[PDB]
Amino acid sequence: ATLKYICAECSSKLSLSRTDAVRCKDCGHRILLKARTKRLVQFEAR
Amino acid sequence: KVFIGRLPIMLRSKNCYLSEATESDLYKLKECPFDMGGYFI
Amino acid sequence: EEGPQVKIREASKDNVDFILSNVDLAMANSLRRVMIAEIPTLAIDSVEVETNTTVLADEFIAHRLGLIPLQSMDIEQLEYSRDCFCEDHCDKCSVVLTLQAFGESESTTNVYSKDLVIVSNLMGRNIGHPIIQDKEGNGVLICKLRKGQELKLTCVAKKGIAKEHAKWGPAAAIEFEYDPWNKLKHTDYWYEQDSAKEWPQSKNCEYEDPPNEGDPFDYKAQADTFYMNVESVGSIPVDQVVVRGIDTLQKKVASILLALTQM
Amino acid sequence: MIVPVRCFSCGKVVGDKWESYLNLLQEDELDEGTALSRLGLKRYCCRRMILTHVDLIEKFLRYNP
Numbered sequence A: 001a002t003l004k005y006i007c008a009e010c011s012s013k014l015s016l017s018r019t020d021a022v023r024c025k026d027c028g029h030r031i032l033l034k035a036r037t038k039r040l041v042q043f044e045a046r
Numbered sequence B: 001k002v003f004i005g006r007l008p009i010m011l012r013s014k015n016c017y018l019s020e021a022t023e024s025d026l027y028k029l030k031e032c033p034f035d036m037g038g039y040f041i
Numbered sequence C: 001e002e003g004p005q006v007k008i009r010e011a012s013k014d015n016v017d018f019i020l021s022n023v024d025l026a027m028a029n030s031l032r033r034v035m036i037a038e039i040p041t042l043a044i045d046s047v048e049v050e051t052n053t054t055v056l057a058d059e060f061i062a063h064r065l066g067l068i069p070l071q072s073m074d075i076e077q078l079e080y081s082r083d084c085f086c087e088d089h090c091d092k093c094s095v096v097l098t099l100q101a102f103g104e105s106e107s108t109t110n111v112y113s114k115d116l117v118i119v120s121n122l123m124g125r126n127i128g129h130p131i132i133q134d135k136e137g138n139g140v141l142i143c144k145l146r147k148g149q150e151l152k153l154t155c156v157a158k159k160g161i162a163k164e165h166a167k168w169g170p171a172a173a174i175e176f177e178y179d180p181w182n183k184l185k186h187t188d189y190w191y192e193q194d195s196a197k198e199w200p201q202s203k204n205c206e207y208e209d210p211p212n213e214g215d216p217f218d219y220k221a222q223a224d225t226f227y228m229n230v231e232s233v234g235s236i237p238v239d240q241v242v243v244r245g246i247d248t249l250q251k252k253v254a255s256i257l258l259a260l261t262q263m
Numbered sequence D: 001m002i003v004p005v006r007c008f009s010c011g012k013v014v015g016d017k018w019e020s021y022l023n024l025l026q027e028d029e030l031d032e033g034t035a036l037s038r039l040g041l042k043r044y045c046c047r048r049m050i051l052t053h054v055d056l057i058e059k060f061l062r063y064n065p
């Protein structure tokens, strides 16, 4: 349902704007990963 | 009673929470069960 | 019934031992090389990745997928993408499969090549079908998923040949030999006391007459008779590799004759 | 990291045998040498493929996310 970030502990599709430092819901883990990409990548089977 | 500085800690000595951690606890801790760790972070 | 003749010693879904006689070492050799590298086969050559929470990277998985053998008996009628007039690929120059697997149970979910799902119209021709020779029927283990890991992919397999990439290899490994007794003298055995006692003997010896103590060297004898055995990965029937291989090499020489014509 | 699909040197598909193999060992208590031969792995190139493999994907899986 769209996101931009993700925590490395609860994997909650978070995502927030400025002035939100860094944190998750209950997971005060100040890490956050940048989800994935929508345009999908193609691969050479070789 | 009174605070004074911080002491980095050798990674697997008495303090380091890993000197006790079992195998299954290491994995959850995102630390490898094969790491020897005699170093500092 | 003419020049190159065959004598088959064994046969099966995967192996064929035979004896080629009345043929130059050359032809025997080329025919062999052709099999190893110039016979069309279908193989996953494109992989689009939707979701990968696996512990393997995308190109890692992809490399294996391209490696999974696929049916290829009717390839002689599937086309080379590079020759098809479509924009990219189509049911005329490809076969699209899909692999969707999700770590459901907490017992480690295994992904096999049998989870591949052909989604393009096979147009009634036998081609594209993960090949499986397993006892439990799981033709090659692609990957392993834990608790709740995903893996969504779409694979496009194309007509190819080993030369481009070993994956389009349908021949596994060929057994080659000739002159089991060193009669011809194409080798100088390295000994330490007794060559004849140090170097084992080939089962082909059994199929040929020994040299006889005092006979002078037959300087006029050349290489006749070759004891081969063609293995097969499955993508194509054993007996087929040999045939098509002979076909291909046959068509190749043909092309040179056409070339001199246009010239 | 997973059983190679296909042996490097000749290409005998060796990806569909990991499990079979590990089974001929455990329950059938066979020596590695006999197990291999029964999986049809006759040439050493093909043998070294399975014998030498280390299935790391197993400890790779053990990390939570």
Ligand SMILES: [Zn+2]
Pocket: A007, A008, A009, A010, A011, A012, A024, A025, A026, A027, A028, A029
């Ligand atoms: Zn969290």
Ligand SMILES: [Zn+2]
Pocket: C081, C084, C085, C086, C087, C088, C089, C090, C091, C092, C093, C094
């Ligand atoms: Zn096309």
Ligand SMILES: [Zn+2]
Pocket: D007, D008, D009, D010, D011, D012, D043, D045, D046, D047
């Ligand atoms: Zn091999």
